Amino acid sequence: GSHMTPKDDEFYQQWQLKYPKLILREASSVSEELHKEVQEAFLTLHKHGCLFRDLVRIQGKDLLTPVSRILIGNPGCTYKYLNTRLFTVPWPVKTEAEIAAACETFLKLNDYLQIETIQALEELAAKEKAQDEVDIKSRAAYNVTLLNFMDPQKMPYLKEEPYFGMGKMAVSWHHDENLVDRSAVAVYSYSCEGRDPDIWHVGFKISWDIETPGLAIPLHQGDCYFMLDDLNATHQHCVLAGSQPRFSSTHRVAECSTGTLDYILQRCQLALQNVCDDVDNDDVSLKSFEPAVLKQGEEIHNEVEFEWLRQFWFQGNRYRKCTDWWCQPMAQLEALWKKMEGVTNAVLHEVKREGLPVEQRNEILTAILASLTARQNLRREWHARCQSRIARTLPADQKPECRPYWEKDDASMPLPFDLTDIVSELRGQLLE
Ligand SMILES: O=C(O)c1ccccc1Nc1c(Cl)cc(-c2ccncc2)cc1Cl
Ligand SMILES: O=C(O)CCC(=O)C(=O)O
Ligand SMILES: [Mn+2]
């Protein structure tokens, strides 16, 4: 395996022939004014300590990213990757005043990249020919940006690129996941100061394929590249380290149909439709015990707890150093989750009620047991993930908080944190 760079004569015809959906707009093609405002916003957020390495899971392993990151985008939006959900520090679409000015900048950067993306996609459809405009507009409607930083001088040893001799990797071969289908990706690259080892490169290869030589594109200060259409799906990309530190801003159309605050709040209101709601107290009484309704309730119970609450607090309130935006949302989701704990408790009581014909009972058990089985298995993995050896080495203001967590004697919670006792009883009844 080999790789092509601008020094190779075949590079330009390999790009033109087999990467027409990869666009490169060099720093000369965007306003100088913008350059300073964006690069100052990078340095500002870095100086304020807003960028964090993420505690991430790959194939059962807990690892921190080589890159320090922050997610900026629409209020209430989330982006999930490698089992970690990032919550946006929001930008001012229709928080300290300095940090808010950097988010405003990256929304301005977002607006410009959106325009450049629509134009590039309109040109490619023209060459393809030589409605669909609704598709182009939505595949360019970036709703988040994931900022990145890495100082390669701080790493003791970087992985060599394993297939084409591209040298040191900062980020390994991967796809950007959980994007809207065939949506574009726009990256602003900011370097602070065979292929050249000192200059940063983005690498590209065809999925499954290490025989076709891969492209290594140099990225100078303020260069922008665009992955269009299905490029992100059909190709892998990586980041090859240079000598200097580098920032990047990767603008994406996150697929957030189950990943906005509005969505999860409405799911919670849907679960609580089965609850008598005159007054918020400890005696939760349900309106229906139809198995489908209960199943839906316990499934929403698991979604808010694990996809939202435990994801959020696993990051140890790292958003505090940037925004307060999620503090009230997160306290309200926890109060709704608390009511659902009372729902589960209520259901448990009904299964124990003398005078419940066993086949009405067995229909109830068959509808909820998968959810509570999943609830305990995921609680063990989240409790372990919060107390792994790699997680205790973190600072005290980024340490993972395993929340919600209560002790076996806490009288405010109607059910214990560990449900194996409970779980094992219900399947005992279902076969007896
Ligand atoms: O590349 C690495 O060596 C690496 C090691 C540990 C953790 C992460 C690593 N890189 C990496 C990072 Cl930062 C992001 C992603 C990713 C981003 C969006 N959607 C899906 C996956 C993949 C990798 Cl491999
Ligand atoms: O930094 C880049 O240029 C690639 C983007 C990236 O690593 C990511 O957003 O996951
Ligand atoms: Mn990437």
UniProtKB/Swiss-Prot annotation:
Alphabetized UniProt keyword annotations: Acetylation, Cytoplasm, Dioxygenase, Disease variant, Iron, Metal-binding, Nucleus, Obesity, Oxidoreductase, Phosphoprotein, Transferase
Organ and tissue specificity: Ubiquitously expressed, with relatively high expression in adrenal glands and brain; especially in hypothalamus and pituitary. Highly expressed in highly expressed in acute myeloid leukemias (AML) with t(11;11)(q23;23) with KMT2A/MLL1 rearrangements, t(15;17)(q21;q21)/PML-RARA, FLT3-ITD, and/or NPM1 mutations.
Keyword flag DNA-binding: no
Catalytic activity annotation: a 5'-end (N(7)-methyl 5'-triphosphoguanosine)-(N(6),2'-O-dimethyladenosine) in mRNA + 2-oxoglutarate + O2 = a 5'-end (N(7)-methyl 5'-triphosphoguanosine)-(2'-O-methyladenosine) in mRNA + formaldehyde + succinate + CO2; an N(6)-methyladenosine in mRNA + 2-oxoglutarate + O2 = an adenosine in mRNA + formaldehyde + succinate + CO2; N(6)-methyladenosine in U6 snRNA + 2-oxoglutarate + O2 = adenosine in U6 snRNA + formaldehyde + succinate + CO2; a 5'-end (N(7)-methyl 5'-triphosphoguanosine)-(N(6),2'-O-dimethyladenosine) in U6 snRNA + 2-oxoglutarate + O2 = a 5'-end (N(7)-methyl 5'-triphosphoguanosine)-(2'-O-methyladenosine) in U6 snRNA + formaldehyde + succinate + CO2
An example molecular function term from Gene Ontology annotations: mRNA N6-methyladenosine dioxygenase activity
Name this polypeptide is given: Alpha-ketoglutarate-dependent dioxygenase FTO
Entry's pH dependence statement: Optimum pH is 5.5-6.
Outcome of mutating residue 246 to Q: In GDFD; has no residual normal activity, impaired ability to demethylate N(6)-methyladenosine RNAs (m6A) RNAs
Protein family membership: Belongs to the fto family.
Activity regulation description: Activated by ascorbate. Inhibited by N-oxalylglycine, fumarate and succinate. RNA N(6)-methyladenosine demethylase activity is inhibited by fluorescein derivatives. RNA N(6)-methyladenosine demethylase activity is selectively inhibited by meclofenamic acid; inhibition is specific to FTO and meclofenamic acid does not inhibit ALKBH5. Specifically inhibited by R-2-hydroxyglutarate (R-2HG), an oncometabolite that also exerts a broad antileukemic activity.
Residues the entry annotates as binding Fe cation: 174, 176, 237
Entry cofactors: Fe(2+)
Note describing how the cofactor binds: Binds 1 Fe(2+) ion per subunit.
